[PDB]
Amino acid sequence: AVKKFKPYTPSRRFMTVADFSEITKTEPEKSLVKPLKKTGGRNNQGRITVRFRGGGHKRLYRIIDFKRWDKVGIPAKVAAIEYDPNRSARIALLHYVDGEKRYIIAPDGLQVGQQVVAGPDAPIQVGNALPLRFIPVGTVVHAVELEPKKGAKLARAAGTSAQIQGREGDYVILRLPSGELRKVHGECYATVGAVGNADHKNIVLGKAGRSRWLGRRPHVRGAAMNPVDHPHGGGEGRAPRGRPPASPWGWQTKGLKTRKRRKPSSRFIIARRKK
Amino acid sequence: MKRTWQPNRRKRAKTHGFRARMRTPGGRKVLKRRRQKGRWRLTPAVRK
RNA sequence: GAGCUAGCCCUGGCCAGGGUGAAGCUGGGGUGAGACCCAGUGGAGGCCCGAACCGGUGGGGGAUGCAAACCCCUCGGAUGA
RNA sequence: GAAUGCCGGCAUGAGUAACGAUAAAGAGGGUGAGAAUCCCUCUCGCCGUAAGCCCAAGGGUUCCUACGCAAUGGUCGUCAGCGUAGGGUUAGGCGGGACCUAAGGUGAAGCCGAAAGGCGUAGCCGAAGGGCAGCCGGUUAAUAUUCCGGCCCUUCCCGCAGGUGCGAUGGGGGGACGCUCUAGGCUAGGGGGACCGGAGCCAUGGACGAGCCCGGCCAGAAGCGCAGGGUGGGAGGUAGGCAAAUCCGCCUCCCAACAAGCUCUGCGUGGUGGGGAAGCCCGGGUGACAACCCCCCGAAGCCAGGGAGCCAAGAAAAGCCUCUAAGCACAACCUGCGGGAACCCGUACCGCAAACCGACACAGGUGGGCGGGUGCAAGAGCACUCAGGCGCGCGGGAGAACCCUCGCCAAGGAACUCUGCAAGUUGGCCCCGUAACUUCGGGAGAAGGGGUGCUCCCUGGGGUGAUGAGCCCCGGGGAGCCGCAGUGAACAGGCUCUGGCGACUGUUUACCAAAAACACAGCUCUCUGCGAACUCGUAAGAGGAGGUAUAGGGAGCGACGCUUGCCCGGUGCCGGAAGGUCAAGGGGAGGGGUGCAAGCCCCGAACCGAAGCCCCGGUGAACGGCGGCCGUAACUAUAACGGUCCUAAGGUAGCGAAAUUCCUUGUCGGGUAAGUUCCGACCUGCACGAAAAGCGUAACGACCGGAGCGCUGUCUCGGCGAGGGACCCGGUGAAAUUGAACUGGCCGUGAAGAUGCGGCCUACCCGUGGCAGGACGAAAAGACCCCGUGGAGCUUUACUGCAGCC
RNA sequence: CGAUGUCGGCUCGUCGCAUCCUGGGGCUGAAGAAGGUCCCAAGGGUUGGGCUGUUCGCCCAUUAAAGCGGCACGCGAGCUG
RNA sequence: UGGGAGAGGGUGGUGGAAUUCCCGGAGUAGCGGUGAAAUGCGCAGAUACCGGGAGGAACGCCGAUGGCGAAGGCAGCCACCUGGUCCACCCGUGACGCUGAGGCGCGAAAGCGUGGGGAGCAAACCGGAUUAGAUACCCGGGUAGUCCACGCCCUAAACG
RNA sequence: CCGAGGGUAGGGCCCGUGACUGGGGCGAAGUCGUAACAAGGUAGCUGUACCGGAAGGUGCGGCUGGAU
Ligand SMILES: NCC[C@H](O)C(=O)N[C@@H]1C[C@H](N)[C@@H](O[C@H]2O[C@H](CN)[C@@H](O)[C@H](O)[C@H]2O)[C@H](O)[C@H]1O[C@H]1O[C@H](CO)[C@@H](O)[C@H](N)[C@H]1O
Ligand SMILES: NCC[C@H](O)C(=O)N[C@@H]1C[C@H](N)[C@@H](O[C@H]2O[C@H](CN)[C@@H](O)[C@H](O)[C@H]2O)[C@H](O)[C@H]1O[C@H]1O[C@H](CO)[C@@H](O)[C@H](N)[C@H]1O
Ligand SMILES: [Mg+2]
Ligand SMILES: [Mg+2]
Ligand SMILES: [Mg+2]
Ligand SMILES: [Mg+2]
Ligand SMILES: [Mg+2]
Ligand SMILES: [Mg+2]
Ligand SMILES: [Mg+2]
Ligand SMILES: [Mg+2]
Ligand SMILES: [Mg+2]
Ligand SMILES: [Mg+2]
Ligand SMILES: [Mg+2]
Ligand SMILES: [Mg+2]
Ligand SMILES: [Mg+2]
Ligand SMILES: [Mg+2]
Ligand SMILES: [Mg+2]
Ligand SMILES: [Mg+2]
Ligand SMILES: [Mg+2]
Ligand SMILES: [Mg+2]
Ligand SMILES: [Mg+2]
Ligand SMILES: [Mg+2]
Ligand SMILES: [Mg+2]
Ligand SMILES: [Mg+2]
Ligand SMILES: [Mg+2]
Ligand SMILES: [Mg+2]
Ligand SMILES: [Mg+2]
Ligand SMILES: [Mg+2]
Ligand SMILES: [Mg+2]
Ligand SMILES: [Mg+2]
Ligand SMILES: [Mg+2]
Ligand SMILES: [Mg+2]
Ligand SMILES: [Mg+2]
Ligand SMILES: [Mg+2]
Ligand SMILES: [Mg+2]
Ligand SMILES: [Mg+2]
Ligand SMILES: [Mg+2]
Ligand SMILES: [Mg+2]
Ligand SMILES: [Mg+2]
Ligand SMILES: [Mg+2]
Ligand SMILES: [Mg+2]
Ligand SMILES: [Mg+2]
Ligand SMILES: [Mg+2]
Ligand SMILES: [Mg+2]
Ligand SMILES: [Mg+2]
Ligand SMILES: [Mg+2]
Ligand SMILES: [Mg+2]
Ligand SMILES: [Mg+2]
Ligand SMILES: [Mg+2]
Ligand SMILES: [Mg+2]
Ligand SMILES: [Mg+2]
Ligand SMILES: [Mg+2]
Ligand SMILES: [Mg+2]
Ligand SMILES: [Mg+2]
Ligand SMILES: [Mg+2]
Ligand SMILES: [Mg+2]
Ligand SMILES: [Mg+2]
Ligand SMILES: [Mg+2]
Ligand SMILES: [Mg+2]
Ligand SMILES: [Mg+2]
Ligand SMILES: [Mg+2]
Ligand SMILES: [Mg+2]
Ligand SMILES: [Mg+2]
Ligand SMILES: [Mg+2]
Ligand SMILES: [Mg+2]
Ligand SMILES: [Mg+2]
Ligand SMILES: [Mg+2]
Ligand SMILES: [Mg+2]
Ligand SMILES: [Mg+2]
Ligand SMILES: [Mg+2]
Ligand SMILES: [Mg+2]
Ligand SMILES: [Mg+2]
Ligand SMILES: [Mg+2]
Ligand SMILES: [Mg+2]
Ligand SMILES: [Mg+2]
Ligand SMILES: [Mg+2]
Ligand SMILES: [Mg+2]
Ligand SMILES: [Mg+2]
Ligand SMILES: [Mg+2]
Ligand SMILES: [Mg+2]
Ligand SMILES: [Mg+2]
Ligand SMILES: [Mg+2]
Ligand SMILES: [Mg+2]
Ligand SMILES: [Mg+2]
Ligand SMILES: [Mg+2]
Ligand SMILES: [Mg+2]
Ligand SMILES: [Mg+2]
Ligand SMILES: [Mg+2]
Ligand SMILES: [Mg+2]
Ligand SMILES: [Mg+2]
Ligand SMILES: [Mg+2]
Ligand SMILES: [Mg+2]
Ligand SMILES: [Mg+2]
Ligand SMILES: [Mg+2]
Ligand SMILES: [Mg+2]
Ligand SMILES: [Mg+2]
Ligand SMILES: [Mg+2]
Ligand SMILES: [Mg+2]
Ligand SMILES: [Mg+2]
Ligand SMILES: [Mg+2]
Ligand SMILES: [Mg+2]
Ligand SMILES: [Mg+2]
Ligand SMILES: [Mg+2]
Ligand SMILES: [Mg+2]
Ligand SMILES: [Mg+2]
Ligand SMILES: [Mg+2]
Ligand SMILES: [Mg+2]
Ligand SMILES: [Mg+2]
Ligand SMILES: [Mg+2]
Ligand SMILES: [Mg+2]
Ligand SMILES: [Mg+2]
Ligand SMILES: [Mg+2]
Ligand SMILES: [Mg+2]
Ligand SMILES: [Mg+2]
Ligand SMILES: [Mg+2]
Ligand SMILES: [Mg+2]
Ligand SMILES: [Mg+2]
Ligand SMILES: [Mg+2]
Ligand SMILES: [Mg+2]
Ligand SMILES: [Mg+2]
Ligand SMILES: [Mg+2]
Ligand SMILES: [Mg+2]
Ligand SMILES: [Mg+2]
Ligand SMILES: [Mg+2]
Ligand SMILES: [Mg+2]
Ligand SMILES: [Mg+2]
Ligand SMILES: [Mg+2]
Ligand SMILES: [Mg+2]
Ligand SMILES: [Mg+2]
Ligand SMILES: [Mg+2]
Ligand SMILES: [Mg+2]
Ligand SMILES: [Mg+2]
Ligand SMILES: [Mg+2]
Ligand SMILES: [Mg+2]
Ligand SMILES: [Mg+2]
Ligand SMILES: [Mg+2]
Ligand SMILES: [Mg+2]
Ligand SMILES: [Mg+2]
Ligand SMILES: [Mg+2]
Ligand SMILES: [Mg+2]
Ligand SMILES: [Mg+2]
Ligand SMILES: [Mg+2]
Ligand SMILES: [Mg+2]
Ligand SMILES: [Mg+2]
Ligand SMILES: [Mg+2]
Ligand SMILES: [Mg+2]
Ligand SMILES: [Mg+2]
Ligand SMILES: [Mg+2]
Ligand SMILES: [Mg+2]
Ligand SMILES: [Mg+2]
Ligand SMILES: [Mg+2]
Ligand SMILES: [Mg+2]
Ligand SMILES: [Mg+2]
Ligand SMILES: [Mg+2]
Ligand SMILES: [Mg+2]
Ligand SMILES: [Mg+2]
Ligand SMILES: [Mg+2]
Ligand SMILES: [Mg+2]
Ligand SMILES: [Mg+2]
Ligand SMILES: [Mg+2]
Ligand SMILES: [Mg+2]
Ligand SMILES: [Mg+2]
Ligand SMILES: [Mg+2]
Ligand SMILES: [Mg+2]
Ligand SMILES: [Mg+2]
Ligand SMILES: [Mg+2]
Ligand SMILES: [Mg+2]
Ligand SMILES: [Mg+2]
Ligand SMILES: [Mg+2]
Ligand SMILES: [Mg+2]
Ligand SMILES: [Mg+2]
Ligand SMILES: [Mg+2]
Ligand SMILES: [Mg+2]
Ligand SMILES: [Mg+2]
Ligand SMILES: [Mg+2]
Ligand SMILES: [Mg+2]
Ligand SMILES: [Mg+2]
Ligand SMILES: [Mg+2]
Ligand SMILES: [Mg+2]
Ligand SMILES: [Mg+2]
Ligand SMILES: [Mg+2]
Ligand SMILES: [Mg+2]
Ligand SMILES: [Mg+2]
Ligand SMILES: [Mg+2]
Ligand SMILES: [Mg+2]
Ligand SMILES: [Mg+2]
Ligand SMILES: [Mg+2]
Ligand SMILES: [Mg+2]
Ligand SMILES: [Mg+2]
Ligand SMILES: [Mg+2]
Ligand SMILES: [Mg+2]
Ligand SMILES: [Mg+2]
Ligand SMILES: [Mg+2]
Ligand SMILES: [Mg+2]
Ligand SMILES: [Mg+2]
Ligand SMILES: [Mg+2]
Ligand SMILES: [Mg+2]
Ligand SMILES: [Mg+2]
Ligand SMILES: [Mg+2]
Ligand SMILES: [Mg+2]
Ligand SMILES: [Mg+2]
Ligand SMILES: [Mg+2]
Ligand SMILES: [Mg+2]
Ligand SMILES: [Mg+2]
Ligand SMILES: [Mg+2]
Ligand SMILES: [Mg+2]
Ligand SMILES: [Mg+2]
Ligand SMILES: [Mg+2]
Ligand SMILES: [Mg+2]
Ligand SMILES: [Mg+2]
Ligand SMILES: [Mg+2]
Ligand SMILES: [Mg+2]
Ligand SMILES: [Mg+2]
Ligand SMILES: [Mg+2]
Ligand SMILES: [Mg+2]
Ligand SMILES: [Mg+2]
Ligand SMILES: [Mg+2]
Ligand SMILES: [Mg+2]
Ligand SMILES: [Mg+2]
Ligand SMILES: [Mg+2]
Ligand SMILES: [Mg+2]
Ligand SMILES: [Mg+2]
Ligand SMILES: [Mg+2]
Ligand SMILES: [Mg+2]
Ligand SMILES: [Mg+2]
Ligand SMILES: [Mg+2]
Ligand SMILES: [Mg+2]
Ligand SMILES: [Mg+2]
Ligand SMILES: [Mg+2]
Ligand SMILES: [Mg+2]
Ligand SMILES: [Mg+2]
Ligand SMILES: [Mg+2]
Ligand SMILES: [Mg+2]
Ligand SMILES: [Mg+2]
Ligand SMILES: [Mg+2]
Ligand SMILES: [Mg+2]
Ligand SMILES: [Mg+2]
Ligand SMILES: [Mg+2]
Ligand SMILES: [Mg+2]
Ligand SMILES: [Mg+2]
Ligand SMILES: [Mg+2]
Ligand SMILES: [Mg+2]
């Protein structure tokens, strides 16, 4: 339930912060964090390979569990729901009856103090984790492995959720958050429910500074550059694109499809994305 | 105003020093060309 | 060759004083319960005034200079991108 | 003899500019061949959030002392950061190493690349971050937490005693964290004393005083006291912490919870050791048996790993603790005590500067800490001032024009000018009061106005203490005093109306542009199913991201409000298993060379044959485009209306003489005495128009217009004054420039602008201060223009390749 | 073209006369007053504002009049910009 | 107190028919549309037919001249939550009533803000016909919107 | 001290006037179409939205004040 501010500064007019209504614990689990090596967009050559990155807050990457088949049958308690600055979801702290402690990505509605579990015979309840083949058709689900035992790859951002459309041999048919219709293997695990903090998208960064705190540096239009810098560079005064709009490296950027044509995954995609 | 020589013993050694030269192939050619000319110092003098 | 300059990384440091007084909390009123209003408390902000510090707006001087970009008067920011 | 030739030497400009902040000098006495310049004394001025003090970096003997003055020193020099010589830097505790990790670097394994090399897990390196044991005083010409003295502490080795399952590079805890705000109690620091100690003082009209002037401390182990921090205890289970585990984690159970207890810090006290002024006397000696106490102010520092709130969610590893494993328990480890042991490097000096970076003893640049007192509301602001440090390494005169900085001005008050450029005005605090409009925050310090000092009296609340005194902090009321004036000095907004652009705070062309430009939250389009797209890379490998479509890339637009119309013919993109074209390859009708021949060899059509192109659709917040002529109303005029040609379609809303209007100072209205600007209008819009967004918009602006008030030396129109120069004298002494020069005016002539030719006129020889008309004055082999089959950046449906992609 | 700085303003002028004013004249469709037109005449004078970069021009208020030109569209080793 | 009817309201869930799209199969030369046609769709295999899948919306028969609500309005089915109302008995309280300026709340459709959703329908808009014209009536497309959550709007031939 | 009023500064209400601009009323015989009254030749009216030279058109809902 996103939170407004009164207009006591120009930026405060439109700014909205998260409500944090579902957060119980307010500091990470010292056993499950590590240092986040901020890169600022540079690669191992030292070269910016991703523009306009750097300078955001310091962060501690909480280790998240994406292979919940690690602990088949060992129930855990939902001990806390905490803020992860490295993603858009919240994370939940699990105290397994094993005594093991793990972070998972917090589905919507998950109740601190409830217990969760994982396995072929798990209950079809928010927070549990089963191979895809054992989840009812028509169930909303998240944290879906793309291949088996390779880790949760799909639907992990706030409010995302794949819905199960049906089965077809060793493969179930998922409707990804993009609207794509894909065949995923039935042995791929997945956490039933939708990822929480759906109000995430309704946030208004308010001002330029807030974007900086996220490590996002200012983004200069190609239209503002010179011909040496950009296809859209130059021009006396203003200027339309003057050619099909294009990236800094030449390739067109309106409509031009870029998925590799002969990709082997093509055999398992039923419908290219909607809308 | 601030000028361009801001001396620094550590920089001056990790940059132009002997060991820096011997790591590169280009650097060994430096010392080779400087021995050939007979330079008294093959390398900047820095006190450390 | 990044000891100048540009960006990012890691680790440290700095920002006199004064002003305004958001949310919240409390109390009071209010109503079926509310919204809400009032007072107090509170002390938010690329908020205000202003040194350090960072600037370089206007004008005068300087022009074989104090100086291969300086000096004086004025002026922008100064918890933040 | 010329190349703006090259190297050198010496001229000219010239005894000319200048001699580096306008903080400032004077005299006496010394030294010496020589003194404005060195030494000493007295007077004067300057800095004092420094122009004082302490670190760091960098510098590298510049430190101290003696002897020197050729050169360096912008003058002088007896002086010196200069020359010669001798001295000077002392550590188990300060810093760095024999400790730890950060980015990054490097790199057994492994990967990759013609070579050189590029990657890379561990590991190693890597500090101004983590960890770690010393405080005060004395001493030298020069070092001091280093030597010395007092009082403390750490680690290693061996031994004694006591205790215990001891044992780790492995397991666990901890280390260990942001920003803002902030409590209690302290300390640093400071103010006052009529209390304590002190050489003295009585001036010049008064004062022998509760007079003046100086000082009234510092460290410190155990113990103790005050303030804080950290911390539950027991038991049973146990499948997790990549072996084990009594530890940790998870579960249950009993007891204990603002506590207490144990533990750790800070402060205070504390054996004890130090220090100790003014003044006088020659750094010292005295003062002195110095005294060393009371009250107040009080941190941003300490207790600290304190508390609260917030969102953007805040290093690692070692030291340390605990768990066990091999092993070993004659061991080993813990504690206490004792003896011994404890290495390498730095330490001088400069350090906002004459010793560092700027070629200079250069008005520039340089990170951290301390930075006293009084007053002004506060403060690191401002004026004076302590400690301390300086008067800036040419001076003396004169009192011109002129220049810089500065002060004042009759009457007028923007009439100046491109422009109020500049300089006035305003200025702090308290109180009263404050409009349109608005996004209800604002606009707002709107505007405008009153007050401000000193004396006496009366009284209200707070902190300390004790509830009182004293100290200290906020106030209230009454009566008076003086001047031109009470933020009496210093620091400290001129205001308002109205448009353009841009929402806003931000960013920019280091060094002629700070803006209307870039950025920006926000809107749309599009790509991306994750070994993602995209980026760098030959590759490996990275970034993307330890992210996963509420995510990430690219593009345009740029808060917000109301909106964003019509065209898919062409271009781009998207879709289309048919058709057409299409290379290598398949096929091999059918020829050809050669051979006695089997054969060997060559050419080769039909037909099959991908992408791409053709072709069919789609698509505008994709590239883009959004007509012409003629006619028509019962005055005229103008056309709601029509006719026709063409297009893919003919510009909708809103706006408009505009940051766009050529004609144009359009026309009309407002403002003014007067208005090529401005504002409001109209609309034949040369040549607006809807995300290269359209029309608005409160607030914001060192943006660009226009206007009014205030006030002025901007101006009528100038005058006077101050200082620093210019001028004169002593000292030192440049520069560009320069064919040579014995270098006048006019009218002509001349390659067309003559000191230099002709004619005439004028003119004794040489300077100094001044002015800039000429020497087509200097400077720069014109930066505009052309030319060169000269170069380079950029573009594209110019050509031809190439990467990449299909 | 191995450089002759280019508009306008300001400051400083100086010359020409095809005379704007002032002085002397002739003719007039010159009654007077006041004009027209031409001749002589360069001694002196030839204002202050609004607008615009402007020169120029229009306008306000005056005036004896508000003259026109040349001097590298006079004058940037004089200033402005 | 004991009983009854009901599409009264809110939530959660769910069933079938139909249309559209998509995949498979079978199949060929037209389908569609109208007053008549054209646009459009279809040999790149449409329409008609069968199986499968996705999704949204509205609920045929019952259904009535019906029932409920203060009005606007409410219709598959199931459960929960909940308003009103009527009958019976004659038990309780004893005028506790009626109306109602302001206040407040509800208020069809369209419309607006932020998300979602989107099958059919359909302003705007395109095209085909008609026509003197046809910015219409008719035909083929078609975007808001129609649906959901939240919050506005407060109008009506809101009528008996 | 108060004090008529004078002055300075800023507000609120009303009146008059204003380039231009919006519709409105009225005025024998101007132009364009034919929306309504007959089922008015698409039943009409309606609230709302969008569109159009103009009456109006269309969408969604509502009324009969709709004929047969
Ligand atoms: N509008 C009503 C006319 C009335 O007569 C009046 O006095 N009208 C005007 C009243 C305005 N408040 C004044 O405007 C100006 O002065 C104010 C101070 N008084 C400023 O606050 C204001 O920021 C400024 O803008 C303006 O001065 C007055 O103008 C008058 O005085 C002028 C010179 O004296 C004259 O030129 C005017 N014609 C005459 O109107
Ligand atoms: N069949 C064709 C219609 C024709 O053209 C016609 O009648 N045309 C009408 C012509 C009349 N003369 C006009 O009336 C006005 O104009 C006159 C001037 N001539 C006046 O004197 C008269 O005093 C006045 O009255 C009137 O305005 C015209 O009517 C049109 O305009 C009127 C205003 O909207 C409407 O009410 C009519 N429905 C509409 O037809
Ligand atoms: Mg708020
Ligand atoms: Mg939350
Ligand atoms: Mg929370
Ligand atoms: Mg750890
Ligand atoms: Mg690397
Ligand atoms: Mg298989
Ligand atoms: Mg972005
Ligand atoms: Mg963006
Ligand atoms: Mg941008
Ligand atoms: Mg540009
Ligand atoms: Mg480049
Ligand atoms: Mg390009
Ligand atoms: Mg371009
Ligand atoms: Mg451009
Ligand atoms: Mg242009
Ligand atoms: Mg791909
Ligand atoms: Mg600078
Ligand atoms: Mg240099
Ligand atoms: Mg530096
Ligand atoms: Mg190597
Ligand atoms: Mg070298
Ligand atoms: Mg750098
Ligand atoms: Mg440096
Ligand atoms: Mg920091
Ligand atoms: Mg400081
Ligand atoms: Mg403060
Ligand atoms: Mg205030
Ligand atoms: Mg308060
Ligand atoms: Mg504050
Ligand atoms: Mg601020
Ligand atoms: Mg200052
Ligand atoms: Mg300046
Ligand atoms: Mg600067
Ligand atoms: Mg500048
Ligand atoms: Mg100058
Ligand atoms: Mg400020
Ligand atoms: Mg920051
Ligand atoms: Mg010769
Ligand atoms: Mg030369
Ligand atoms: Mg001389
Ligand atoms: Mg001379
Ligand atoms: Mg000097
Ligand atoms: Mg000089
Ligand atoms: Mg001087
Ligand atoms: Mg001086
Ligand atoms: Mg002598
Ligand atoms: Mg001197
Ligand atoms: Mg440095
Ligand atoms: Mg040196
Ligand atoms: Mg020394
Ligand atoms: Mg000498
Ligand atoms: Mg000498
Ligand atoms: Mg000599
Ligand atoms: Mg000398
Ligand atoms: Mg050793
Ligand atoms: Mg190490
Ligand atoms: Mg390497
Ligand atoms: Mg260290
Ligand atoms: Mg140490
Ligand atoms: Mg000696
Ligand atoms: Mg000692
Ligand atoms: Mg043990
Ligand atoms: Mg941590
Ligand atoms: Mg924060
Ligand atoms: Mg102390
Ligand atoms: Mg004090
Ligand atoms: Mg006496
Ligand atoms: Mg006495
Ligand atoms: Mg495990
Ligand atoms: Mg284990
Ligand atoms: Mg394992
Ligand atoms: Mg295990
Ligand atoms: Mg085990
Ligand atoms: Mg108990
Ligand atoms: Mg305790
Ligand atoms: Mg102590
Ligand atoms: Mg003695
Ligand atoms: Mg003694
Ligand atoms: Mg004595
Ligand atoms: Mg501080
Ligand atoms: Mg503090
Ligand atoms: Mg902690
Ligand atoms: Mg064992
Ligand atoms: Mg054993
Ligand atoms: Mg034994
Ligand atoms: Mg023990
Ligand atoms: Mg010992
Ligand atoms: Mg050693
Ligand atoms: Mg060494
Ligand atoms: Mg030393
Ligand atoms: Mg020093
Ligand atoms: Mg110093
Ligand atoms: Mg310093
Ligand atoms: Mg010095
Ligand atoms: Mg230097
Ligand atoms: Mg030097
Ligand atoms: Mg000097
Ligand atoms: Mg200096
Ligand atoms: Mg600086
Ligand atoms: Mg201080
Ligand atoms: Mg004080
Ligand atoms: Mg301080
Ligand atoms: Mg002193
Ligand atoms: Mg000194
Ligand atoms: Mg001087
Ligand atoms: Mg002069
Ligand atoms: Mg005056
Ligand atoms: Mg005046
Ligand atoms: Mg002007
Ligand atoms: Mg102006
Ligand atoms: Mg000014
Ligand atoms: Mg004023
Ligand atoms: Mg407000
Ligand atoms: Mg206000
Ligand atoms: Mg304003
Ligand atoms: Mg005021
Ligand atoms: Mg204002
Ligand atoms: Mg006063
Ligand atoms: Mg006073
Ligand atoms: Mg006084
Ligand atoms: Mg007390
Ligand atoms: Mg008096
Ligand atoms: Mg004052
Ligand atoms: Mg101010
Ligand atoms: Mg005004
Ligand atoms: Mg304009
Ligand atoms: Mg701006
Ligand atoms: Mg602001
Ligand atoms: Mg610049
Ligand atoms: Mg530059
Ligand atoms: Mg600016
Ligand atoms: Mg926007
Ligand atoms: Mg590449
Ligand atoms: Mg690769
Ligand atoms: Mg990663
Ligand atoms: Mg733009
Ligand atoms: Mg608005
Ligand atoms: Mg059309
Ligand atoms: Mg196309
Ligand atoms: Mg097409
Ligand atoms: Mg070929
Ligand atoms: Mg072929
Ligand atoms: Mg093909
Ligand atoms: Mg476009
Ligand atoms: Mg458009
Ligand atoms: Mg006519
Ligand atoms: Mg007629
Ligand atoms: Mg067409
Ligand atoms: Mg056009
Ligand atoms: Mg249109
Ligand atoms: Mg116009
Ligand atoms: Mg135009
Ligand atoms: Mg005009
Ligand atoms: Mg005009
Ligand atoms: Mg203008
Ligand atoms: Mg036109
Ligand atoms: Mg016109
Ligand atoms: Mg146009
Ligand atoms: Mg466009
Ligand atoms: Mg508005
Ligand atoms: Mg605006
Ligand atoms: Mg700004
Ligand atoms: Mg500005
Ligand atoms: Mg003057
Ligand atoms: Mg003048
Ligand atoms: Mg003077
Ligand atoms: Mg003189
Ligand atoms: Mg002289
Ligand atoms: Mg002569
Ligand atoms: Mg001639
Ligand atoms: Mg001549
Ligand atoms: Mg001459
Ligand atoms: Mg002279
Ligand atoms: Mg001259
Ligand atoms: Mg020359
Ligand atoms: Mg020249
Ligand atoms: Mg040339
Ligand atoms: Mg040109
Ligand atoms: Mg050629
Ligand atoms: Mg040619
Ligand atoms: Mg060429
Ligand atoms: Mg030339
Ligand atoms: Mg003028
Ligand atoms: Mg003048
Ligand atoms: Mg003359
Ligand atoms: Mg003439
Ligand atoms: Mg004449
Ligand atoms: Mg006659
Ligand atoms: Mg007469
Ligand atoms: Mg005549
Ligand atoms: Mg003459
Ligand atoms: Mg003329
Ligand atoms: Mg003109
Ligand atoms: Mg005219
Ligand atoms: Mg006359
Ligand atoms: Mg000319
Ligand atoms: Mg000229
Ligand atoms: Mg000039
Ligand atoms: Mg000029
Ligand atoms: Mg200028
Ligand atoms: Mg200029
Ligand atoms: Mg200019
Ligand atoms: Mg019952
Ligand atoms: Mg019942
Ligand atoms: Mg076929
Ligand atoms: Mg669904
Ligand atoms: Mg009924
Ligand atoms: Mg009965
Ligand atoms: Mg009965
Ligand atoms: Mg009865
Ligand atoms: Mg009864
Ligand atoms: Mg009764
Ligand atoms: Mg009764
Ligand atoms: Mg409604
Ligand atoms: Mg509706
Ligand atoms: Mg609308
Ligand atoms: Mg939406
Ligand atoms: Mg037609
Ligand atoms: Mg026709
Ligand atoms: Mg037509
Ligand atoms: Mg009809
Ligand atoms: Mg809409
Ligand atoms: Mg009704
Ligand atoms: Mg009815
Ligand atoms: Mg009165
Ligand atoms: Mg009066
Ligand atoms: Mg007034
Ligand atoms: Mg008539
Ligand atoms: Mg009709
Ligand atoms: Mg009709
Ligand atoms: Mg009809
Ligand atoms: Mg009818
Ligand atoms: Mg109707
Ligand atoms: Mg029309
Ligand atoms: Mg039309
Ligand atoms: Mg028409
Ligand atoms: Mg209608
Ligand atoms: Mg129509
Ligand atoms: Mg229509
Ligand atoms: Mg209807």
Numbering used by the authors:
A (entry chain 1D): 2 to 276
B (entry chain 17): 1 to 48
Sentences from the paper on this structure:
The majority of antibiotics inhibit protein synthesis by targeting the ribosome, the molecular machine responsible for decoding messenger RNAs (mRNAs) and correspondingly incorporating incoming amino acids into the nascent polypeptide chain. The most common clinically used aminoglycosides harbor the central 2-deoxystreptamine (2-DOS) ring joined by glycosidic linkages with amino sugars. They interfere with protein synthesis by targeting the region of 16S ribosomal RNA (rRNA) helix h44 forming the decoding center within the 30S subunit of the ribosome (inset 1). Binding of 2-DOS-containing aminoglycosides to the decoding center displaces two universally conserved nucleotides, A1492 and A1493, promoting their interaction with the minor groove of the codon-anticodon duplex in the aminoacyl (A) site of the ribosome.
The crystal structures of the Thermus thermophilus 70S ribosome in complex with mRNA, tRNAs, AMK or KAN were determined at ~2.9 Å resolution by molecular replacement using a high-resolution model of the 70S ribosome with the tRNA and mRNA ligands removed (see “Methods”). The initial difference Fourier density maps calculated using the Fobs – Fcalc amplitudes revealed, as expected, clear unbiased density for AMK or KAN in the canonical aminoglycoside binding site in helix h44 of 16S rRNA (inset 1). One secondary binding site for AMK is in the vicinity of the P-site tRNA acceptor stem 3’CCA-end and the P-loop of 23S rRNA. The hydroxymethyl in ring III and the amine in ring II are within hydrogen-bonding distance of the non-bridging oxygen atoms of P-site tRNA A73 and C2254 of the P-loop, respectively, and the amine of the AHB group forms multiple H-bonding interactions with G2252 of the P-loop. The difference Fourier map of the T. thermophilus 70S-AMK complex revealed one AMK molecule bound between the 30S and 50S subunits at the center of bridge B5. The inter-subunit contact surface area (~1185 Å2) is increased to ~1430 Å2 upon binding of AMK at bridge B5, suggesting that AMK strengthens this inter-subunit contact and may stabilize the 70S ribosome. Two additional AMK molecules are observed in the T. thermophilus 70S ribosome, one in the 30S subunit and one in the 50S subunit.
